[PDB]
């Protein structure tokens, strides 16, 4: 700050589709094939 113009200087410085069966691993939708068979909403 002692009479700085650096701030002024900085401004100067700037001058058959198969996506149904293949949802992305990231997505919520993807359930593993191995776990495809737990059939109980109760326990889960």
């Amino acid at each position: 700050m002692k009479d700085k113009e650096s701030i002024e200087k900085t401004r100067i410085n700037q001058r058959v589709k198969q996506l149904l069966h293949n949802p992305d691993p990231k997505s919520t939708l993807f359930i593993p094939e191995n776990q495809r068979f737990d059939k109980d909403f109760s326990v889960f």
Binding site: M1, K4, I7, E8, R11, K26, T28
Partner: protein, 430 residues
């Protein structure tokens, strides 16, 4: 269980929406990718695992700004199909964006609004941003407000419109569509806040000491004001205020809901820490006429009601001791039929700083939303500008040929005359 949806239409609206959405993401700790490395629920929604999606929609007929948004660092944040874009711009013609090309786009926007609203359970209201002096902005804002007022009814809508400066102007035809849009939102919006660029330029020059500002510096201040207004919904506070608790405190009559804002303190890190920033001095600075966020003089009119928000470590007794001092001063006078005119809110979360920005980090801040009788001057000067060219019917052929009738200009003039008469009738003492 409290939500709000923000609507951004036009180039200015999108460019201020970007400004507010860096700030919200920074304030809630969300990375630009949307991933965190229970207060977020007001602006965001949880997808079940991982990222957060903003409760915002971007509208424009001209594709350049949206394409810039969809390639920047925030490409992963927004849902891909809520950035509605057109092909042909309205080109500053109000009749285009209200009668010709906006009608074919408005249905998709309304479908998106419904799809976002069905997710919310405690919807507080809507926010809308639009620069008034443009074709698509004003026209689509008018059409969206008119559709929402009948689709939903009593839900509250807030408008952060940016009116043209008294003498500084970028277009040559902006008074026409400014007057028409004021006509449209006079009977359709619950709150309208004044935001002309010249006052904020003067604020930056005097306080921030920037001699060459750009639009980003203006939009950051507007974003800070929005954050200060909506902080009370997502942070714990000793004296809370909700959005629905406004028309009962700032709006004396249904017609009068245009008010002008101010913010304090505004100071750079190079000289911020040399002074103590007490609550009394910041609340004095907030009431200074030169720190109004719209280029209007409050000394030329009475006050009707003042709603002013604090945040940080402020104590209520210090707030009362400062409201008394302001009531004492002889240069600030309130209207006769309002003995007390202050609504005070106190929040604990200090304002957040954006890296590489202008403002420094402080522990106390104040944001005021004040309704005053002096606002009639901007209406009078816009009316005078409108009359000069409407006397010779200049530029009218660009509007008549886009489906608008000849008489539509006159009734907006009559409504402005009615508003100016109403403002004079209210301000006289009994």
């Amino acid at each position: 269980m409290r939500e709000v949806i923000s609507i951004h239409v036009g180039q200015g609206g999108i460019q201020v929406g970007n400004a507010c959405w860096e700030l919200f993401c920074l304030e809630h700790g969300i990375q630009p990718d949307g991933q965190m490395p229970d207060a977020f629920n007001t602006f965001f929604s949880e997808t079940g695992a991982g990222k957060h999606v903003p409760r915002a929609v971007f509208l424009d007929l001209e594709p350049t700004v949206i394409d810039e948004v969809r390639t920047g660092t925030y490409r992963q944040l927004f849902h891909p199909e809520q950035l509605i874009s057109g092909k042909e711009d309205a080109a500053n013609n109000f009749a285009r964006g209200h009668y010709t090309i906006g009608k074919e786009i408005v249905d998709l926007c309304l479908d998106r609004i419904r799809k976002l609203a069905d997710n919310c359970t405690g919807l507080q209201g809507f926010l809308v941003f639009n620069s008034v002096g443009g074709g698509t902005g004003s026209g689509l804002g008018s059409l969206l407000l008119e559709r929402l007022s009948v689709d939903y009814g009593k839900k509250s809508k807030l408008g952060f419109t940016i009116y043209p400066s008294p003498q500084v102007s970028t277009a040559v035809v902006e008074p026409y569509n400014s007057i028409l849009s004021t006509h449209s939102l006079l009977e359709h919006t619950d709150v309208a806040v004044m935001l002309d660029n010249e006052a904020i330029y003067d604020i930056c020059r005097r306080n921030l000491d920037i001699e060459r500002p750009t639009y980003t510096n203006l939009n950051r201040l507007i974003a800070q004001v929005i954050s200060s207004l909506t902080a009370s919904l997502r942070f714990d506070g000793a004296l809370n205020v909700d959005i629905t608790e406004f028309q009962t405190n700032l709006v004396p009559y249904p017609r009068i809901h245009f008010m002008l804002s101010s913010y304090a303190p505004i100071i750079s890190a190079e000289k911020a820490y040399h002074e103590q920033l007490s609550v009394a001095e910041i609340t004095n600075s907030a009431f200074e006429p030169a720190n109004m966020m719209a280029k209007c003089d409050p000394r030329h009119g009475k006050y009707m009601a003042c709603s002013m928000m604090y945040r940080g470590d402020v104590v209520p007794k210090d707030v009362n001791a400062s409201i008394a001092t302001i009531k004492t001063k002889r240069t600030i006078q309130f209207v006769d039929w309002c003995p007390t005119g202050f609504k005070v809110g106190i929040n604990y979360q200090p304002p957040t700083v954006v890296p590489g920005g202008d403002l420094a980090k402080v522990m106390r801040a104040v944001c005021m939303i004040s309704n005053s009788t002096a606002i009639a001057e901007v209406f009078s000067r816009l009316d005078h500008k409108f009359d000069l060219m409407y006397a010779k019917r200049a530029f009218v052929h660009w509007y008549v040929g886009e489906g608008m009738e000849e008489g539509e200009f006159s009734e907006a003039r009559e409504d402005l005359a009615a508003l100016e008469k109403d403002y004079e009738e209210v301000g006289i003492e009994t």
